[PDB]
Amino acid sequence: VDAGFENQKELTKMQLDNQKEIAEMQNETQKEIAGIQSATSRQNTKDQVYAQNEMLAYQQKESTARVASIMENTNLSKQQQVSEIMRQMLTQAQTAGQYFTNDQIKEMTRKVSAEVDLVHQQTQNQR
Amino acid sequence: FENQKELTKMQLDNQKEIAEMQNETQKEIAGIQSATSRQNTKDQVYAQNEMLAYQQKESTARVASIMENTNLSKQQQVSEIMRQMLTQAQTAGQYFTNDQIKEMTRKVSAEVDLVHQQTQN
Amino acid sequence: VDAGFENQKELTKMQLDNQKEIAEMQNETQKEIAGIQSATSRQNTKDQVYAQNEMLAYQQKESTARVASIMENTNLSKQQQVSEIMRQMLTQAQTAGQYFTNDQIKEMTRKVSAEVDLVHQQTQNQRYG
Amino acid sequence: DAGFENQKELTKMQLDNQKEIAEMQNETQKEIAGIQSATSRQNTKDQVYAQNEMLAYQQKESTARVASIMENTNLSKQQQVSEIMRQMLTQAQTAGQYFTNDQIKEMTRKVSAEVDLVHQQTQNQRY
Amino acid sequence: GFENQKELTKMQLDNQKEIAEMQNETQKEIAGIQSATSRQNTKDQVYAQNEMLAYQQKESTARVASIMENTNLSKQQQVSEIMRQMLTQAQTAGQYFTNDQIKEMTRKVSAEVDLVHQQTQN
Amino acid sequence: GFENQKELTKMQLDNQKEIAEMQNETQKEIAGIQSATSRQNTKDQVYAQNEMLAYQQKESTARVASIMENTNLSKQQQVSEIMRQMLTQAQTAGQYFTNDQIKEMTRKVSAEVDLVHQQTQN
Amino acid sequence: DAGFENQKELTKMQLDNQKEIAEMQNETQKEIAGIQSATSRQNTKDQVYAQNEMLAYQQKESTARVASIMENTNLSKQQQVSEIMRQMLTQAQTAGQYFTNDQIKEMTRKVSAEVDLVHQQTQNQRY
Amino acid sequence: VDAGFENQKELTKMQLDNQKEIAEMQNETQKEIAGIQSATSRQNTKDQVYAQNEMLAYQQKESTARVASIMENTNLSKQQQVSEIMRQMLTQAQTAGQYFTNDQIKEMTRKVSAEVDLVHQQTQNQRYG
Amino acid sequence: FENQKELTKMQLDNQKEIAEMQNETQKEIAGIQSATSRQNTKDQVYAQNEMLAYQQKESTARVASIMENTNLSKQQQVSEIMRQMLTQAQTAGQYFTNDQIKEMTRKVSAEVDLVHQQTQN
Amino acid sequence: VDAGFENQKELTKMQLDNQKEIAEMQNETQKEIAGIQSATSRQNTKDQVYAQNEMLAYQQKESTARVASIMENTNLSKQQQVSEIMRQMLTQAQTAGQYFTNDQIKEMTRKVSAEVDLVHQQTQNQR
């Protein structure tokens, strides 16, 4: 029952328990630090995303409103196409009319010239 | 066995004291780093956060305006329909006008002959 | 009071205090480095956000101005809707008018035609006399 | 050698202490990693939340825009036809304007002649 | 003899510290290098935004004055829409009275057709 | 005796390795955790862009067809500008001839003034 | 104790070796840091080059835009005045349209009466 | 061949090879971890650039279409310049015409005035008879 | 003194061999990291690089168009000047027309009296 | 001249030179690695900035062109303001004219009514 070696087995035990307690303290410190880091990272993220989340409800209502308006633009476009077709038909009638008006202009020109000769001869005859 | 246990105990109490103050320093430094991170983040998001409310009431105003454009568009669709009908009537009228133009041309021609023969006299 | 133990307690203390003073100087170096780092990071961020913070007030009064203009656009749009409705009624009246006018055009054509016959007649009477 | 058993035993105390220390350091590293992972996942979800929430709105607005764009295309085609009709009306009208230029000149001669007649009348009535 | 334990030990202990001192000094100089670098990078990075700030501000002020004038114009356009609504109502009533006139004038043209015909028939 | 040096040494040597083995295994598990996390973050991040891709593509295709029709319309508008240039030249010559007519018609109105006056004077 | 001098000397060999090693490791850390610094500076300059080169262009374009914006403001004021003038023209025209409505009705009575006259003429000429 | 040296050469080799095999296993762990990291980073980036690469071809034909439209806008703008020049000439002719027309307006005013006198005269002659 | 120097020499040759293969591994791992960084960067800049040329010829087209807008604007300034002059002439004409409107009103009034007295007869 | 201690001073020297050579090898390795990192970082940066630099010359010419166009818009705006003033004056003249036209419309209405009475009495008198 060796007293000197039991003494060595008290010394050694003191050293190893010192080592272990230290290792635990360092581990506790590291976990504590990671907790601080994680909480800071989370708080930074929440702070960053605040703006975009609030804006979010507003952006959704604007988009829904825009959809209704865009669909009405699509309908206006369909009506405008119908209007274009009708107006094409009016333009075709007006084109034919301008040609007939052209023929008439020439006839009216001959008439004016003849009236010129008439007024000339009246003027001679009064003179 | 007491003096040697004591040489030991001083070695270990030192070791432990170094480790405590090392850990202490590590926690301090993370404290500084956290405080700096939080503060930078705040200063960064300051502007977007300050613009929030302006952007919101501007968006709401825009919603009201867009809805009024939707209403104007519906009225315009109706107007296109009214104008479609007016245009059909005007096209038929242009065709009748075409015939009138031709009769009027014959009339003008005939008036030319009668001016002519008026001019001898 | 045995010489060995006390003299190697001396020897041991020399080492324990050298390692403690080494560790203290190390910690001091760590905290200083961290201070320099933090100050750098802060000054960086301030320098980064200067412009956006500066533009803030301008952006706000411009936004408020735009709101007033948008609301007036809304009001104008309402007035235009009323104008569209009145103009629809005018157009409807004008369409009916164009139809009545179409019939008038045909009657006038008949008239011109009859006047042509009259002019030919006058011409022929002039020739005949 | 029942004696060296003792020297071995202190040594066994030393190795076991070493490994339970190492194992606790390992479990610590693992726990830290898991904290960091949960934090990173949470940050990401908080970050992508807004864009994910706008998705459906953006898609339905895009579908509305596609329909409108296609109707604009149809209108563009009708307008091309209208431009063509109108090129022809313009052609007819240019020809008419040239015939009208000749008519303007003849009508001017007529007005001139009427001036001569009115002058003669005035002269006859004055003396 | 022991005193020379106390010389060897000192030599070891002090070499330890002088080494640690050189190492700390190195750490600090490296940090200073990195800090200076980081600060200068930031200056280089923010130069352009800072130099554009004043232009952006005065442009924003100009835009504000313009936006306010557009607001005033919109109010004037609203009043104009109102005046024009009244003109359009009056024109609609005018078109209805005109519709009746068109019908009477047609009747007149028809009767004139009969007159011209009868004048040629005799 | 020495053989038991060769037992103590082995016990130390093998404890060394079993410790190193537990440590490597820990390293690998940590890396796997980080990798999985990183990959899943990326999936979460790219979800929306990926889900919008198809809408963006078909919208782009629609826009292309529309842009091409605008190009065709622009060509038609150019031709229209040309036709209208010719009409405008003709109208300018017409305005010059009309200018002369205006002067003659004024002379006529003046003479008619003298006629009406002389008719009232007697 | 000229003997322990020897034991000291091996020890001196050991400390000096330790420090020249440490010093070379230090100079190495410094050199690495300087490489990293020059690299970071170069990257930054290469990065900001484009924006710095666009600066002057953006500024002069902004000055041009300011001048244009201010002229738009002046035009807006003139247009406000034009809207006002035109409100008044429109007012005058609305009043005119009401007087014209009464005129339209009287002219209709006249046309009607002329129809009665033409009819009577036709009747007299027919029988 | 002395027992001490050889037996502690044995003892020493046990340690040197334990530390070499420890280091080898460590390196192996390092390289594996690095492989996993690299594969993760690559797969991440691919996953990140998928969309932009997908949109590439669409963006290119849209850009080419826009180029054709812009060039046609350029051509149209040239035609509009020519139209502006012709219309300037028409406007100049119309301005001269408005001035001649102004004088005609004044002469017509004089005429109406004279006609008023004539109508009063006719009225008075009707009363007088 | 040879056997002990040899126990030593084996210890140190081991030490050195571990260090060589440790360094070797470090260089290998940096090789992997570099290759991964270069490859990611390439894949990242692929799209912007592929769009480069399209963006350039589109920009050039835009330059030509903008320059034509500048020319059209100059012509429009001239047109505004022509229209300014036409407008002044039209305003003077409107004033002369105003006087004519008033004479024509007096004339119409006088014609009213003469219609009246024509109606007894 | 102690041979055994000179022997210790050959052993020790071998150990310390081993240590030093190793430290140098590790340093050389670390510098090599930093060289690899720096070159990769530089190549990544150049690759990244390629696009924006090329674009840069094109962006500068577009901006210069835009400046010329914006300045011409400013000039057009000044002319349009002059045009607005002239048109205000025309609108004022036209407003006065519409009022005079209003008075005339009333007079014309009285005249038409009187012509109605006249045509009525002619129709009675032919009957």
Residue to mutate among A115, A121, A124, with most D CBs inside 10 A, is A115
Those residues with Cβ within 8 angstroms of residue G104's Cβ, 6 or more apart along the chain or in another chain: E94, E97, E98, E101
Burial class (CB in 10 A: 0-12, 13-18, 19+), H125: exposed
DSSP states of E102-113: HHHHHHHHHHHH
Query: Taking Cα atoms as reference points, which of E108, I48, B94 lies closest to residue J119?
Result: E108
**Which segments of chain J are extended strands (E)?**
none
The residues near B30 (Cβ < 8 Å, ≥ 6 apart) are: A33, A36, A37
User: What count of other Cβ atoms lies within 10 Å of the Cβ of residue F104?
Assistant: 17
Four-residue CA torsion sign, A95, A97, A103, A108: negative
Rg (CA), chain A: 52
CA distance I108 to J108: 6
Give every CB contact of residue H3 below 8 A, 6+ residues apart in sequence. none
CA-nearest of H55, A26, E94, B120 to F53 is: H55
Residue H118 in tokens: 């004539």
Q: List b or e across J99-109, with b for residues whose CB sees 16 or more CB atoms inside 10 angstroms.
A: bbbbebbebbb
What residues in E contact C80, CB-CB < 8 Å?
Answer: 81
Query: With contact defined as beta carbons under 8 Å apart, do A107 and C116 qualify?
Result: no
| Radius of gyration for chain H, computed over Cα atoms and rounded to the nearest angstrom | 53
Cα–Cα distance measured from residue E57 to residue C56, given in angstroms and rounded to the nearest whole number:
10
Distance CA B80, CA C87 (A): 11
Tokens of B24: 């202490």
Taking an 8 Å cut-off on Cβ atoms, the answer to whether B25 and C20 are in contact is: no
Write out the two tokens for F30: 């940590």
C43's CB contacts (< 8 A; 6+ apart) are E39, E42
Q: F89 with H88: CB under 8 angstroms?
A: no
Q: For the CA atoms of chain C, what is the radius of gyration?
A: 53
Best mutation target among E16, E44, E116 (most G Cβ atoms within 10 Å) is E44
Identify the experimental approach. X-ray
Are residues E72 and G72, on separate chains, in Cβ contact within 8 Å?
no
The single-letter code of the amino acid at F13 is: L
Yes or no: say if D28 and F27 are a contact pair by the CB < 8 Å rule: no
> Nearest to residue A23, comparing CAs of C24, C18, C22, D28?
D28
Tokens for C94? 């004008």
Q: How many residues does chain J have?
A: 127
Whether residue A59 and residue D64 make contact (CB cut-off 8 A), yes or no, is: no
| Torsion sign across C-alpha atoms H34, H35, H36, H37 | positive
Q: Which residue of H22, H50, H114 is in closest CB contact with F17? A: H22
Tokens 């003899």 belong to: E1
**In angstroms, rounded to a whole number, what is the distance separating the alpha carbons of residues A120 and A118?**
5
Residues A34 and B33: beta-carbon distance below 8 Å: no
3-state DSSP call for residue F17? helix
CA B55 to chain centre: 11
CA distance B68 to A66: 11
The CA distance from J41 to H55, in Å, is 28
Could you tell me how many CB contacts below 8 A there are between chain E and chain G? Answer: 172
For A3, counting Cβ atoms within 10 Å of its Cβ (0-12 exposed, 13-18 middle, 19+ buried), the class is exposed
> Alpha-carbon torsion I66, I70, I71, I75, what sign?
positive
The whole-angstrom separation of Cα E101 and Cα E111 is 15
Residue type, position B4, single letter: Q
Residue H122's closest CA among A61, G32, I117, J34? I117
Q: Could you tell me if D54 and F44 are in contact, meaning their C-beta atoms sit under 8 angstroms apart?
A: no
- Resolution in units of Å: 2.4
Residues on chain J touching G14 (C-beta within 8 angstroms) = 12, 16
> Which residue in the set E37, E59, E119 is minimally distant from G41, CB to CB?
E37
Task: Kindly report the number of other CB atoms within 10 A of residue J59's CB atom.
Answer: 19
Angle between helical axes of E2-121 and G4-126 (0-180°, round to 10): 10
Compute the C-alpha angle D101/D105/D111, nearest 5°: 135
User: Which tokens go with J43?
Assistant: 């190549």
Give dist(CA G33, CA G39) in Å, integer. Answer: 10
- Gap between the Cα atoms of C102 and C105, Å rounded: 5
Cα–Cα distance list, H60 to C71, F54, F55, I53 (Å)? 40, 16, 17, 10
Q: What H or E segment, with its residue span, contains residue A9?
A: helix A3-126
CB D101 within 8 A of CB F95: no
The DSSP output letter for E17 is H
Q: Residues G50, J56: contact at Cβ < 8 Å?
A: yes
Q: What are the DSSP calls for A25-73, one per residue?
A: HHHHHHHHHHHHHHHHHHHHHHHHHHHHHHHHHHHHHHHHHHHHHHHHH
3-state class (DSSP) for residue D38 = helix
Give the closest residue to E98 by CA, choosing from C27, B118, G102. G102
Q: How far is CA G118 from CA E104, E109, E116, G121, in A?
A: 13, 10, 11, 5
Check CB contact under 8 Å for F120 and H118.
Answer: yes
Cβ–Cβ < 8 Å for D55, A54: no
The CA–CA distances, whole Å, from E72 to B57, C67, E78, G84, I95 equal: 21, 13, 10, 12, 31
**CA–CA dist G119, H90 (Å, integer):** 50
DSSP per-residue letters across C36-94: HHHHHHHHHHHHHHHHHHHHHHHHHHHHHHHHHHHHHHHHHHHHHHHHHHHHHHHHHHH
DSSP string, H80-91: HHHHHHHHHHHH
Buried b (16+ CB within 10 A) or exposed e, H57-83: ebbeebbebbbbbbbbbbbbbebbbeb
Q: B2: how many CB neighbours lie within 10 A of its CB?
A: 7
Neighbours of E93 (CB within 10 A): 17
Chain F hits for H108, Cβ within 8 Å: 109
CB-based contact D14 A12, cutoff 8 Å: yes
Chain F interface test: which of H19, H37, H43, H69 (most F C-beta within 10 Å): H69
Residues of A in contact with D75 (CB under 8 A): 77, 80-81, 84
* Chains A and D are in contact, defined as 3 or more C-beta pairs closer than 8 angstroms: yes
CA distance D23 to D43: 30
Do F113 and H114 form a contact (C-beta atoms < 8 A)?
yes
Q: What region, left, alpha or beta, does residue B83 occupy, with left being phi > 0 and alpha being psi -120 to 50 degrees?
A: alpha
CA–CA distance, I113 with I106 (Å, rounded to integer): 11
- Spatial CA neighbour of J77 closest among I67, E60, E59, G76: G76
What tokens does A77 get? Answer: 């476009």
Residue among C66, D68, C90, D50 at smallest CA distance from B60: C66
Which tokens in the block code for residue B39? 């503060």
Q: Which residues of C touch E89 (CB under 8 A)?
A: 86, 89
Local structure of residue D2 (DSSP, 8 states): T
Total domain count, chain G = 1
- Tell me the C-alpha distance between G37 and E33, whole Å: 7
Largest interatomic CA distance in chain J:
173
Residue F91: half-sphere exposure toward Cβ, Cα within 13 Å: 19
Q: Which of B66, D4, F19, E110 is nearest to G111 (CA)?
A: E110
The Cβ of residue H119 has, within 10 Å, a number of other Cβ atoms equal to: 19
Q: Which two tokens stand for residue B114?
A: 């009668």
| Contact between residue D24 and residue A22 where contact means Cβ atoms under 8 Å apart | no
**Tokens 């508008």 label which residue?**
F77
Which residues have a Cβ under 8 Å from the Cβ of J8 and sit 6 or more positions away? Answer: G10
Query: Per the structure block, which two tokens stand in for I44?
Result: 């990242």
Contact J69, G64 (CB under 8 A): no
Q: Quick one: angle between helices F2-121 and D4-126, nearest 10?
A: 10
- Residue H10: alpha-carbon gap to chain centroid: 79
Residues ≥6 apart with Cβ < 8 Å to A105: D96, D99, D100, D103
Q: Which residues of J touch G106 (CB under 8 A)?
A: 109, 112-113, 116
Distances (CA, A) of H39 to F35, H32, H35, I82, J96: 9, 11, 6, 73, 85
- Residue E108 C-alpha, separation from nearest chain G C-alpha, in angstroms: 5
Q: Give the list of residues 6+ apart from residue C105 with CB closer than 8 angstroms, or none.
A: B93, B96, B97, B100
Closest-CA residue to J127 (of F117, C128, G124): G124
Cα-to-chain-centroid distance, residue G70: 15
Q: How many residues does chain H have?
A: 129
Burial of F79 (0-12, 13-18, 19+ CB in 10 A): middle
H105 near I93, Cβ under 8 Å?
yes
Amino acid at position A118, single letter: L
Domain that holds residue J46: 1-127
Greatest alpha-carbon span in chain A: 173
Q: Residue C108: name the closest of A109, D53, E106, F51 by CA.
A: E106
Beta-carbon count within 10 A of A123 CB: 17
Residues 6 or more apart whose Cβ sits within 8 Å of residue C129: none
Distance, CA of I98 to CA of I104 (rounded, Å): 10
| Strand, helix or coil for residue G9 | helix
Q: Helix (H, G, I), strand (E, B), or coil: what is residue J1?
A: coil
